[model samples]
Target: QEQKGDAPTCGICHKTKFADGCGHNCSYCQTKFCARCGGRVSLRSNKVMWVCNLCRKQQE
Candidate 1:
C-alpha cells in the first residue's frame, strides 16, 4: 500500500500535513498511509522511513 493517498491528503491536520518533509519515524504514518493497511511495514532502510501521526502514538 502507499503511505500517501493516490492524491495527497495534506489537509489531514491544519489543512497541511506534509508542507515540509515528515519526521518519518513511526514507519507506518506516511509510507504505508499509501498502503491499504493490509499489514505492518518493515523498516529495512532508514532513508525512506515514514510514519503516521496516529501510528506514531501507538509506537510510543
Candidate 2:
C-alpha cells in the first residue's frame, strides 16, 4: 500500500490522498479506495454497503 505521510492509498487504483480527497473502505475486504474507485450500494432489507471494484468483480 502506498502511504503519503500517513494517508492510505487506493487498493485498486493505488491513488494516494493526503487531504481533501475522500477515501472509502470496501465492506467486503476492508481495503481503502478512492471515491472514484468504489461506491455505495443498497443491499437487501434497505441496507447500504460500500464496495470496491475488486470485490465487485469477484461477486460477478
Candidate 3:
C-alpha cells in the first residue's frame, strides 16, 4: 500500500518502482515486489504468473 506515483512500492523489499526497478504483483498473495524479490513462473494452465519470495517460501 506504499504509493509514490501511479504505482506502489514493492510490499516485500519496499523498493520503489521509480528508480529501483519494474515488478508485478504476486499471483498467490497479491503483493507487489521488485524483480530481485520476485520472478515469473509458468503455471499448469500454461499461463505465466508472478510470485514473490515470501509466497514462494511458504509454498516450499
Residue-wise C-alpha lDDT for candidate 2, range 1-60, written one tens digit per residue: 544656556777686662555467788888777777777766886876778877776776
**Which pairs of residues collide in model 3?**
none
lDDT of 1 by residue, 1-60 (tens): 456534343323333333244322334433423222222345665455545556655665
- What TM-score, computed on C-alpha atoms, does each candidate reach? 0.32, 0.56, 0.61
What is candidate 3's lDDT per residue for 1-60, written digit by digit as tens? Answer: 445556557776675563444467788887777777877777787887888877777786
The count of residue-pair clashes in candidate 2 stands at: 0
- Among residues 3 or more apart in sequence or in different chains, the pairs in candidate 2 whose N, CA or C atoms overlap within 3 Å are none
RMSD of each: 8.4, 4.5, 4.1
Please give the range of 10 consecutive residues that has the lowest summed lDDT in model 2.
15-24
Selected candidate, larger TM-score, 1 vs 2: 2
Over 4 Å off, model 1: 1-7, 17-26, 29-46
* Model 2 accuracy (lDDT, Cα): 0.72
Highest TM-score: give the candidate number: 3
Q: With candidate 2 superimposed using the best TM-score fit, by how many Å does residue 60's alpha carbon deviate from the native? A: 3.9
Evaluate model 3: give its TM-score: 0.61
- Estimate the lDDT of model 3: 0.72
